[PDB]
RNA sequence: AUUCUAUGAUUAGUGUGAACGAAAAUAGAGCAGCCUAUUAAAAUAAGUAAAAUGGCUUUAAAGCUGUUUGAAUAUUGUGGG
RNA sequence: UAGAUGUGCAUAGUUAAACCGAUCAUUAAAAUAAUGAAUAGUGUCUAAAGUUAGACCCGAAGCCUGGUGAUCUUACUAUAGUCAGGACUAUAAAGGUCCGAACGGGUUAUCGUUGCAAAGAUAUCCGAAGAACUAUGGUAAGCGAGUGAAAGACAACACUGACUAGGAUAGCUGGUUUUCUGCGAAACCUAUAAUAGUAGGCAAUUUAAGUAACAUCUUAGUAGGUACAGA
RNA sequence: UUAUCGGUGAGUAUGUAGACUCGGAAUGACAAAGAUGAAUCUUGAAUAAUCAGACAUAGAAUGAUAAGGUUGUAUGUCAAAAGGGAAACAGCCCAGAACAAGAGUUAAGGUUCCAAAAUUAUUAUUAAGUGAAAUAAAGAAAGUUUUUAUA
RNA sequence: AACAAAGCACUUUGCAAAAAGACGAUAAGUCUAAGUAUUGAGUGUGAUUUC
RNA sequence: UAACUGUGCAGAUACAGUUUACCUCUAGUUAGACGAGAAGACCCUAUGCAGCUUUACUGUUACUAAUUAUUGAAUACGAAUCGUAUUAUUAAACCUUAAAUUAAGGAACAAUUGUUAGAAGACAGUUUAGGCCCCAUAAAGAGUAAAUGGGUGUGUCUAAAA
RNA sequence: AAAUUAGAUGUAAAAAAAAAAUCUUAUGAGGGCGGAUCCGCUUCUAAUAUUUUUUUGUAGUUAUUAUUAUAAUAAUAAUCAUGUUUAUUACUUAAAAAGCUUAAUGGCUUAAUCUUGCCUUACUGUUUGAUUAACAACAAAUCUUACAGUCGCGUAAGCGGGGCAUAGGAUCACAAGAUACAAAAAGGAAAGAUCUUGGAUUUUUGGAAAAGCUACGCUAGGGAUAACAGGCUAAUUUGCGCAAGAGUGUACAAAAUGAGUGCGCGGUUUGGCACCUCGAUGUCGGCUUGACUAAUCCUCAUGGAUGCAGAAACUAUGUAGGGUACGACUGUUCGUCGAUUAAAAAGUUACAUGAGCUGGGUUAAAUACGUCGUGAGACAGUAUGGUU
């Protein structure tokens, strides 16, 4: 004696259903999900919208599948023609908007600061063109260093800031969520981002290769001056 | 005996942990998980 | 101060459970204070308080106890809770 | 005269809990972002009830504690008594010797079976100087077991552990007393050291608030593969 | 070299079916609207009994296609339901008893007598008391009737 | 036909303060025993004959 | 307070049908009244009991060993303090004989107390009552029983990279 | 026989236009009419589908042939190709099978399979609607939604709260982190409280630390049939019949005989069931006394029998009036034998009959032996004894 699984149809055709209601429990897709329907992990079909269950076949979608849908109007018939405009319901209620306004207080009912902030302290014409190329690169290299120095000042101030906030029991401590946002704003995990750029690496690889080859030129030329004196 | 239950301790020193199973004849576990105390994804490492 | 009755209380608490189960306080019955005790007693208490261990009681405290050990001397803050 | 006194419940909700409070709780900071919870009590009588007490009534075998009994019977103990006659044997008297009365047993059969008898009658049979039998006292018995030529034998109606007094339970069985009126089941599922029980459902009853209630049919629609038929 | 053995290919060939179903009912199930109906339903408050069921009919499992056997399903009765019929009868066929009256009207079932009501009409068979309210079989044979052929 | 039994066998008991054994909510102590290894207790066997 | 056949909680004096029989006693007899009595006899049940057994569960003891205390000396040795070994002791621990002593012997053992460990059914109490998954049975929704039929079923595997 | 590799369907790719009809749809004409969008009626246009419908066109290019004056015309064949022919792109290619953690079932081929890149959402809190109100209760479970937080992948849309689906148990105690709730005079603490998590043949898996005997058994009950008989059934039988006829009978089926079978009756043996508690485990024996049945051992009548000459005997049809004795050995009936006899046949009746007898039996406690068990004990054992 096992516990019965009770598989099969839980809603017959034209039966009213609201979102989440199970329509068909199955082992595998005996009936595929169709219009306004969801399939769960175990292939159970649920209504996604309020409406009436409809069992149909869509030869345009799949030649040999049978689907279950949900129509907002009991008199509608599926499958809807592919060229007809989608039938959808708003599903929203109108309410007056909020009158929220920035009214952050400074002191609690006991006269104590809500937050106390502490900061820390610690080749004729080509040469002309190449010069324009070098200047542009040198200009950006100066700008990059003129702005990377700026980022190192905002990070230092942020990571060094300490906003102590009033908590229960008249205690003053830093909240854990603010401690998390010290390293950086949410949205990405600091450290996973690649600090370097692939294009910059290629540029460095060439420069190192040039000095190496050019290094042999100077050493080879230097050796020639020593040989001239010998001869 | 073949499988052990390890504890992945947060590296934010917040005291939150995740428990996953792994075979003994394998390497220690190490994952990037969400620490609900600081509400940020940090590095979790096996306890021992 | 003690004793008797009810409430406090199928409570605090204990116990795997089943069950077991206070005290403060309140009300009533009685009421009484003393050591020169209204019938003749203390020169204010040392193998004692307490500790370890084996049990009892119990909530782990307090209380009772066999074995082995073992203190201090008054609010000018000594000793018990 | 005046003032105080004597349990309790309700008046505010919320959370594990406090803070907090028409707001509170989870959201590791908070914030209508989400979710839950908000408004007549109290006393009395009549009746039906849950709980704890004997608990609707009657009924065990047993277990523990305190007492009683060895005038029955078993063994031992002290003091006493009894055993016609004959035969054999080494003795006058030396033998668990022989036949057989008293006495002590109880072998076989019959009767009896609300008997004369809660162990008898008749006949038959066994021992009958010995490990014999009998009398009057004494000692030893009931958590442990007294006594036992040993049979779970006997210890005064009872003994695989007596009698008496005190303290029980029984999911098991039986019984539960006047009339009239209205409604009216189930013998199924789940759990259970459970199946003779019980609990939660389904669900019978009472009487209030609701009903786009429930039942049946018609019309259109939907799920699902049996009978049949087929290879 | 075989209308021998096995195997393979073809067949719109024949059969077989709890785990074959291309085809495919009725029944039953779900829900919508309308109508009808004897409140039969839901909720609130209060609060039960019951937890070996039995037989009948259909269709199965099991047994041996045995059991007044055992075990599911569908429907009913009994259980807790008297009355009429089944000779007597828990379970079958009818029908649900508040009390009387009536050659009243009917169900199931019956109508010669016991015993209320037909010895009522029509057409055939049976001659064995077969039979007449619980079918013993295969089979045999100048029993007899009818039909179809036939001399 | 069972128990006992005489006979036989084995184990244990040295008695110097308690011989062993039995008994004593548990001891002093009692039986053993006014006994002493040929004594006492326990165990099995069951005269003798053959073993 | 009849016989037969039938029926029926399944063996009829009492029901159905038929049959038979004047009323009422006496003495005999025991076929039936599932005759009376004995809860006498058998099986099953109870999370009822009793006794017994054991390599059942949990315990207490017989018994063995160690140890603080009663309990001190002398010497030797090992680590003034501890521990070990031996010797002696009216030279008043304690023990035995002995009204019970400057007597005799034993002797720091024994014995007793507390604690600890081991240990006999010798004794006591109590117990002894298999989940999950798939298919068919299953009767065209779901459900559906049987020490029913099938399954070499399952009591898991898996961090993803070298 | 069994090793690797290569294979194993077909089609299409210049291009159509146009007429009406049948529905169906439309957030089209804000159509019209009733009650811009709702609802019931509705004409028109548009789109999809369908017709076999109504047709028209089916070229151009390369080449061939024919006529015409290298060109023109007609027919025929080829024609996806401005593209590294290994072409490419789209559709098509039964079922089963392989693969998807593991059996089976279903599903997936348009991905749930496979390969590759980057990842670790196998996330935290709360929460929605369902499983015709999960398991016909509760709980542990299964699927699903939303909001906040912040991460991955992706051009984007978006997807992600592990796995294609269906096979891994709580509390208590204990342990490791967080929470900052309470802290028994007070300040701390201990021991508690909330959240997360771990170790379980908690495998009797809604969750006890657990062996037997009693024939000396006790009490309370049920008689779920247990020792009997009755009741239902008839597998089996040491109970029978009928039908058919392989075969035997020197010949010749049916004088006799009758394989393996079929259709049956009947309730004696061994069974099944369990309505039912009662005189039992050899369920039965002997004695006394019967009553009934007929499937006949004796006695009486009789058919068949190349296999009835006579006699005897065989087979069958009528017939149950009266008989079917006596003893030995076997616990018993089972049986076996002895000698007579016309013959020494069977069955039913609660073993027919123990409020008629017996105790051969139906049950004990004693004792010995045998077998089994560590033991208490057990045995359909054996022997003696045992209030009817
Ligand atoms: K409490
Ligand atoms: K204390
Ligand atoms: K004599
Ligand atoms: K007795
Ligand atoms: K009624
Ligand atoms: K009689
Ligand atoms: K008589
Ligand atoms: K014993
Ligand atoms: K069905
Ligand atoms: Mg009080
Ligand atoms: Mg004082
Ligand atoms: Mg003290
Ligand atoms: Mg203290
Ligand atoms: Mg004190
Ligand atoms: Mg409050
Ligand atoms: Mg006497
Ligand atoms: Mg003599
Ligand atoms: Mg003699
Ligand atoms: Mg005697
Ligand atoms: Mg008599
Ligand atoms: Mg019913
Ligand atoms: Mg019960
Ligand atoms: Mg089909
Ligand atoms: Mg039945
Ligand atoms: Mg009843
Ligand atoms: Mg009736
Ligand atoms: Mg009639
Ligand atoms: Mg009339
Ligand atoms: Mg008449
Ligand atoms: Mg007749
Ligand atoms: Mg001898
Ligand atoms: Mg002694
Ligand atoms: Mg002997
Ligand atoms: Mg002998
Ligand atoms: Mg009868
Ligand atoms: Mg009558
Ligand atoms: Mg017991
Ligand atoms: Mg000396
Ligand atoms: Mg015991
Ligand atoms: Mg079904
Ligand atoms: Mg439910
Ligand atoms: Mg404190
Ligand atoms: Mg304190
Ligand atoms: Mg269970
Ligand atoms: Mg369950
Ligand atoms: Mg029954
Ligand atoms: Mg022949
Ligand atoms: Mg004859
Ligand atoms: Mg003749
Ligand atoms: Mg003749
Ligand atoms: Mg005559
Ligand atoms: Mg007889
Ligand atoms: Mg009789
Ligand atoms: Mg015996
Ligand atoms: Mg023996
Ligand atoms: Mg005798």
Report how far ligand 42's centroid is from the alpha carbon of A172 (Å): 25
What's the rounded Cα separation, in Å, for the pair A161 and A87? 54
CA A190 to C1' E137, whole Å: 100
Token code pair at residue A51: 């409406």
- Nearest chain A alpha carbon to B35: A180
- Under 8 Å between Cβ of B26 and B36: no
> What are the start-end ranges of the E strands in chain A?
8-9, 16-17, 22-25, 32-33, 37-39, 45-47, 51-57, 66-71, 115-118, 162-166, 172-173
List the beta bridge partners of residue A89: none
Name the strands in the sheet holding A32-33, side by side, starting at the edge strand that comes first in the sequence.
Answer: A16-17, A51-57, A66-71, A32-33
Nucleotide closest to A43 measured between CA and C1': H165
> A171 forms bridges with which residues in the sheet?
none
Distance in angstroms (rounded) separating the CA atoms of residues B46 and B7: 6
**Alpha-carbon distance A6 to A37, whole Å?**
21
Of A73, A79, A37, nearest to A57 by C-alpha is: A79
Q: From start to end of A109-180, where are the E strands? A: 115-118, 162-166, 172-173
Check if the beta carbon of residue B19 is closer than 8 Å to that of residue B5: yes
Run of H or E including A86:
none
Preceding peptide of B17 cis, ω within 30°: no
Q: Which residues contact B43 (CB under 8 A, 6 or more apart)?
A: B10, B11, B30, B31, B32
Which residues in chain B have Cβ-Cβ distances shorter than 8 Å to A177?
Answer: 38-39
Residue A30 has what DSSP assignment?
S
Experimentally determined by: cryo-EM
Dihedral sign computed on CA atoms, order A109, A164, A188, B5: negative
In the block, residue with structure tokens 């854990």: A176
CA dihedral A26, A32, A33, A38 (to 10 degrees): 40
DSSP state of A150: H
Look at residues A142, A111, A13 and name the one whose alpha carbon lies nearest to residue A68. A13
Cβ of A186 less than 7 A from strand D: no
Q: What is the length of chain B?
A: 48
Residue in chain A nearest B33 by alpha carbon: A189
CA distances from A187 to A165, A181, A183, A190, A204 (A): 25, 10, 12, 9, 31
Other Cβ atoms closer than 10 A to A182 = 15
Tokens of A177: 């969520």
Contact status, residue A56 vs residue A14, Cβ threshold 8 Å: no
| Cα B46 to averaged position of ligand 4 atoms, centre (Å) | 79
| CA–CA gap between residue A96 and residue A134 (Å, rounded) | 61
Q: Identify the CA nearest to A158 among candidates A182, A194, A142, A179.
A: A182
CA of A73 to C1' of H35 (A): 21
Q: Which nucleotides of G are covered by protein (CB under 7 A)?
A: 132-135, 141-146, 157-160
DSSP β-bridge partners for residue B9:
B17, B45
C-alpha closest to that of A70 among A52, A44, A87, A88: A52
Q: What is the largest CA-CA distance in chain A?
A: 110
Instruction: In whole angstroms, give the CA distance from residue A8 to residue A44.
Output: 10
Contact criterion met (CB below 8 Å) for A59 and A82: no
Q: Which helix (H) or strand (E) holds A110?
A: none
Distances (CA, A) of A42 to A54, A56, A64, A194, B9: 21, 21, 21, 41, 33
- The tokens of A210 are what? 């040039």
The beta strands (E) that lie in chain B are given as 3-10, 17-23, 30-35, 40-46
Q: In Å, what is the separation between the CA of A98 and the C1' of H329?
A: 125
Sign of the Cα torsion A46, A49, A52, A54 reads: negative
Tell which phi-psi region holds residue A121, choosing left (phi > 0), alpha (psi between -120 and 50) or beta: beta
Rounded Cα–Cα distance for residues A204 and A92 (Å): 58
Give CA angle at B29 (B26, B31), nearest 5°.
150
Q: How many CB atoms lie within 10 A of CB A33?
A: 20
């Amino acid at each position: 004696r096992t516990i019965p699984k009770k598989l099969g149809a839980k809603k017959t055709g034209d039966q009213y259903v609201i979102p989440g209601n199970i329509i068909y429990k199955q082992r595998g897709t005996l009936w595929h999900p169709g219009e306004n329907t969801i399939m769960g992990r175990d292939h159970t079909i649920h209504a996604a919208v309020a409406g009436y269950v409809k069992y149909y076949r869509d030869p345009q979608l799949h030649p040999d599948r049978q689907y279950i849908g949900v129509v907002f109007n009991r008199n509608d018939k599926l499958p809807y023609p592919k060229d007809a405009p989608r039938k959808r319901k708003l599903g929203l209620v109108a309410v007056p908007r909020k009158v929220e306004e920035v009214e952050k207080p400074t002191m609690s009912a006991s006269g104590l600061p809500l937050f106390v902030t502490r900061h820390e302290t610690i080749s004729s014409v080509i040469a002309e063109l190449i010069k324009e190329k070098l200047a542009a690169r040198a200009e950006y290299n100066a700008r990059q260093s003129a702005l990377r120095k700026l980022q190192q000042q905002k990070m230092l101030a942020r990571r060094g800031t300490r906003v102590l906030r009033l908590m229960n029991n008249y205690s003053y401590r830093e909240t854990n969520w603010e401690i998390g946002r010290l390293i950086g704003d949410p949205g990405s995990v600091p450290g996973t981002e690649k600090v370097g750029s692939r294009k910059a690496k290629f540029r460095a690889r060439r420069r190192r290769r040039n000095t190496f080859l050019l290094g042999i030129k100077e050493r080879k030329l230097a050796k020639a001056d020593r040989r001239e004196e010998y001869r | 005996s073949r499988i052990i239950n390890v504890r992945l301790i947060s590296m934010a020193m917040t005291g939150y942990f995740y428990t996953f199973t792994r075979p003994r004849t394998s390497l220690p576990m190490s994952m990037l998980k969400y620490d609900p105390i600081v509400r940020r994804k940090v590095l979790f490492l096996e306890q021992k």
